[PDB]
Amino acid sequence: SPHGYIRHFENEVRDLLQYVDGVTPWKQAQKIRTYWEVRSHHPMPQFNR
Amino acid sequence: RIGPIGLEPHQFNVPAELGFVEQYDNLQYKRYDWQGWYQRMLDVHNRNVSLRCRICDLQRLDGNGVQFVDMQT
Amino acid sequence: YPFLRRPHINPSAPYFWSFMTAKSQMAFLPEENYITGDWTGKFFVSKRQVYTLQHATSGAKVRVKIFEFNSPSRWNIGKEMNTLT
Amino acid sequence: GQDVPKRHTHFVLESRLMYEKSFRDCWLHSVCRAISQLDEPLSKTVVGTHQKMLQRKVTCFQYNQYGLFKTPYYRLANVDRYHAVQGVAGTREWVPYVNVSYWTMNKMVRGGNLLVHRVHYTGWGTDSHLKKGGWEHRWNKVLQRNVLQYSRI
Amino acid sequence: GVHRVGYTHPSTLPVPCAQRWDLRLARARIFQEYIEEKAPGAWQLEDERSMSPEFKTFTGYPMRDMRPGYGQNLPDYIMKKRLPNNTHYELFARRDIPNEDNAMYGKYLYD
Amino acid sequence: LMDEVEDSLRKFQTYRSRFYEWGRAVKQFDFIEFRRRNGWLYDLHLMK
Amino acid sequence: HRMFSFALDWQSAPVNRLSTDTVHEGESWDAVAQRLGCSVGELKDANAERETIEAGVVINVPVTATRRLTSFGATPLVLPLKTTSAKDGERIRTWEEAAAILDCTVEELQQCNGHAALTYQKEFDSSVTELVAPLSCWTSTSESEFSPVERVHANDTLVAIARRLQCSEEALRAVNDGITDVSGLDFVRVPPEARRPRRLVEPQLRPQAATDALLARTIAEEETFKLKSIPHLPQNAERFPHEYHTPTS
Amino acid sequence: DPNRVGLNAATLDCRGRIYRWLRRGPFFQVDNYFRRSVKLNRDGTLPTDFVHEAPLMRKIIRLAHRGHLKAACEEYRRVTTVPPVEVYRALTACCVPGAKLADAVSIFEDGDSKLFYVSRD
């Protein structure tokens, strides 16, 4: 069993990514949007800081 | 000195040191229902193994007659 | 008391998207802006849900712990419920 | 008596269960956050649309976990086990080694249960690193003993 | 000033020799070293409180990185952080009990 | 000789997996209860 | 060497090198040892059971052979579905039928071919023309493993490239048309009798089909929904330098 | 029995169950999940015959017969059930032509005392 940092977990990251791609459909993952995709509906989305 | 010994010309013998820590409790965590996870904590906290080798020990001849570690190596 | 470790945690024009909001726009919306699993209905939503287009478009019920948002507009889109109150 | 009322025992046991849920969920939550919030490509093999689809899928997996422990450790790390007085970590109302409040530490000093040595209240004790640089230098010395003395492999 | 980082293949040199960048790539292959692309060349700041021998808190390793805002949201900080598995928190979770006798046995079993 | 060697091995040998479980209070109190119930069968001083 | 390239790009050390090989049609004891880069007497000592070799027999590679092959070579094995060489004489309409042909399980063909399994059931709807084999059924050849060409330095002679590839000088000129001066060439062909060749890719590097087996549902639903691009930054993001800061800069 | 594959877990309700959870050994989850799972049957045969883990054994034997020791070792890490004796035979026979004695001894000792003596063949 690996211990400590996440760089020592090689097989566990692979099994987690394979399981996440296995159980999750794509028609659910389409609905999650980023912040600018929501902010694009604002009348003034963009300005300099 | 424990360890395997290679007689084939593609097997070099490196005399190396191994440092490790043994720790067992004898005062409070010697025995009770906590003793298992405390001993596991002492073992996983002492999981370090230090493998040391002098480069001068690597500058020997291989099974093929050539030196194992030269200057550029 | 240590720095910014209080357990119990404003209008600004040039710092609108950068004050009490996420640092990057690449990141996704938080967990309260989506339905996790099988729900019987929540009495109120959390304060960290981002007001989206569908909040002002559909407008079924907006209950924030109380607060009733019955005035939909597009100037709230893209911002969490903290600065809207 | 007897030791402490049972509501405080329930509170300390809920704090221990929160610690156990942190040990359960921290690796999974950290891997999900580090995949989902990365803009650089993950590998040569997975690039472009595959990386964005994988990030959206791991974000959908991360949001679907009801009860995932994402709470930081310092929010409820001031729970006392013997008495119900709530202290603040970072101030003098809490001691870190025996993990009790100032009141409980004074009662266990006056009771004689601990083996503690009294030193002058305006000095730095006996630790040469503590007399040298203070709390930050002993902090860095504990860091140097724990991590930085090992050549990583 | 502003320049582009160069690379010369050993087949192009009049005397071939192993470069330092492919040696870095071999070291990253061996030890699984993450190579950050967006690391700027201008920001090479040493922790001079610890690195300098004429300071009071002198420890030969840089104890803190000179980066304002090295927070939890950055994934490279998440990758190189120590996980709290079998740290002192595990001892606190399994030891700090309001009665120690409920940690050495079950009370029904002892009675 | 194999009987004597297995006798001395079960007297002085343990593995790592048993060393994580050999100090549980259940086994210690079962040892105490087994000494209390039938210690007239296994004791150097109770034969007398 | 990106972030999460420690799990998805690289294998653990060491790399598996094949210690078994199969003798081809016209191969002899001097021809297998030339292909494996070993001596002839060293090849016979590892195969002291067999006095002679026939075609298609399993030989044991000696462990000090310098032309050993890695598992799952970089050339994918393709299988046409409309081939009439099966028992029915028409296109394959069964996952177990293609698994019996490719000598694999049903599940290895589903993770490798997700677009054939998710779109159409186990029929098969002939819009799919062919399918790729899973990684466990691939084979590695000595021409695809080692590179068929060698770079030329600025100060190369014919003796230098011969000593570098551990071949003879006349073996190099035979493949390269007897050319002596190598100044006007940026590449030279390597003879197959060169004992020290250059591999094509890194052997510790993972093949892309092994990672695409982890991404079986990624590639399956990508061809169905016809997703070609997802934007990460908006159309006017480069006009505002301080507004858009991803957590990598 | 492909339908009844699965294990139910607890909820840690009362205070004594919390105290038992804080007094558990270093291997309590994996030990109880392993012993609540596959075990020696009533007539004495192995619990090898598993429906859901059947093609993984075929893949392991197919990869250990073609000389791919590392891939067979990698998909040996993914096993949940007790693997058959043919897995150990194919793995050790893959260890023979490379003279890899330590890998073969580890392959034998993995199933020797831990997995109901399946490699004692």
Side-chain angles (χ1 to χ4, degrees), chain B residues 9-57:
Chain B
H10 69 272
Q11 292 181 320
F12 193 82
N13 289 277
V14 183
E17 285 182 355
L18 284 176
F20 69 104
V21 193
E22 312 92 317
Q23 188 168 188
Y24 314 101
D25 200 76
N26 63 98
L27 306 178
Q28 174 193 352
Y29 314 98
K30 178 186 186 181
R31 78 282 187 188
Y32 275 142
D33 274 9
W34 52 59
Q35 178 255 345
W37 61 263
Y38 194 87
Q39 189 56 252
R40 188 56 178 169
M41 175 165 50
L42 278 185
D43 290 358
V44 174
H45 195 249
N46 299 318
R47 73 189 186 273
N48 163 76
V49 169
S50 87
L51 166 66
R52 305 161 175 166
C53 45
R54 300 137 73 175
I55 315 183
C56 82
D57 290 347

Side-chain angles (χ1 to χ4, degrees), chain G residues 20-23 47 49-50 53-60, chain H residues 65:
Chain G
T20 51
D21 200 287
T22 168
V23 181
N47 305 284
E49 164 192 70
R50 311 187 185 274
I53 56 184
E54 304 95 28
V57 72
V58 173
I59 202 167
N60 281 337
Chain H
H65 279 171

Side-chain angles (χ1 to χ4, degrees), chain F residues 20-21 24, chain H residues 23-25:
Chain F
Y20 288 160
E21 309 283 343
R24 305 276 300 189
Chain H
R23 277 182 279 104
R24 71 188 159 93

Side-chain angles (χ1 to χ4, degrees), chain G residues 221-242:
Chain G
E221 312 188 77
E222 186 175 356
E223 319 303 313
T224 299
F225 286 87
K226 293 297 294 173
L227 181 67
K228 311 321 294 172
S229 198
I230 316 168
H232 75 304
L233 255 59
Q235 69 276 337
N236 224 26
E238 291 86 4
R239 206 183 177 95
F240 304 95
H242 202 65

Side-chain angles (χ1 to χ4, degrees), chain H residues 17-28:
Chain H
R17 279 156 61 155
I18 307 301
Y19 281 153
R20 175 170 163 87
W21 178 259
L22 293 166
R23 277 182 279 104
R24 71 188 159 93
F27 313 101
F28 188 78

Side-chain angles (χ1 to χ4, degrees), chain G residues 38-248:
Chain G
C38 47
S39 288
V40 180
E42 184 205 339
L43 178 63
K44 296 177 180 179
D45 287 3
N47 305 284
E49 164 192 70
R50 311 187 185 274
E51 293 88 19
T52 184
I53 56 184
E54 304 95 28
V57 72
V58 173
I59 202 167
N60 281 337
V61 185
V63 71
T64 60
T66 75
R67 274 177 156 266
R68 295 180 62 190
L69 300 175
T70 49
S71 316
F72 324 119
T75 59
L77 194 148
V78 294
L79 174 76
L81 210 53
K82 307 170 186 175
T83 298
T84 185
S85 199
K87 60 98 176 179
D88 56 312
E90 202 30 73
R91 204 182 52 98
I92 307 171
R93 303 187 184 101
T94 296
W95 279 110
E96 284 84 13
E97 184 180 8
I101 288 181
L102 279 182
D103 190 13
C104 73
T105 80
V106 194
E107 291 86 354
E108 293 190 51
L109 272 171
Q110 292 177 9
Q111 278 74 243
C112 203
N113 300 302
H115 58 279
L118 175 136
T119 51
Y120 308 126
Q121 66 269 12
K122 172 158 50 61
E123 208 76 23
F124 262 66
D125 283 6
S126 303
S127 58
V128 284
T129 78
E130 57 98 10
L131 54 88
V132 293
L135 186 81
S136 158
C137 321
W138 292 3
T139 185
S140 72
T141 52
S142 176
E143 57 90 19
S144 87
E145 177 83 23
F146 306 98
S147 87
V149 77
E150 166 61 40
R151 299 201 56 166
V152 189
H153 294 178
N155 59 345
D156 280 334
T157 76
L158 277 187
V159 183
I161 321 174
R163 206 198 305 114
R164 185 193 316 164
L165 300 174
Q166 290 287 85
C167 77
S168 79
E169 302 175 60
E170 282 79 15
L172 191 65
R173 303 151 65 96
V175 196
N176 301 272
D177 305 334
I179 303 176
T180 317
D181 181 86
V182 295
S183 57
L185 305 96
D186 52 310
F187 277 101
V188 284
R189 296 185 183 182
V190 52
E193 54 263 47
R195 292 183 295 265
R196 194 195 297 164
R198 282 196 150 90
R199 295 182 184 266
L200 199 65
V201 303
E202 195 74 35
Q204 211 179 340
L205 206 59
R206 297 231 306 174
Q208 207 179 27
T211 308
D212 287 338
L214 317 177
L215 307 181
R217 210 173 173 173
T218 293
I219 309 168
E221 312 188 77
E222 186 175 356
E223 319 303 313
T224 299
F225 286 87
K226 293 297 294 173
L227 181 67
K228 311 321 294 172
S229 198
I230 316 168
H232 75 304
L233 255 59
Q235 69 276 337
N236 224 26
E238 291 86 4
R239 206 183 177 95
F240 304 95
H242 202 65
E243 181 70 24
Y244 302 97
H245 283 175
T246 179
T248 50

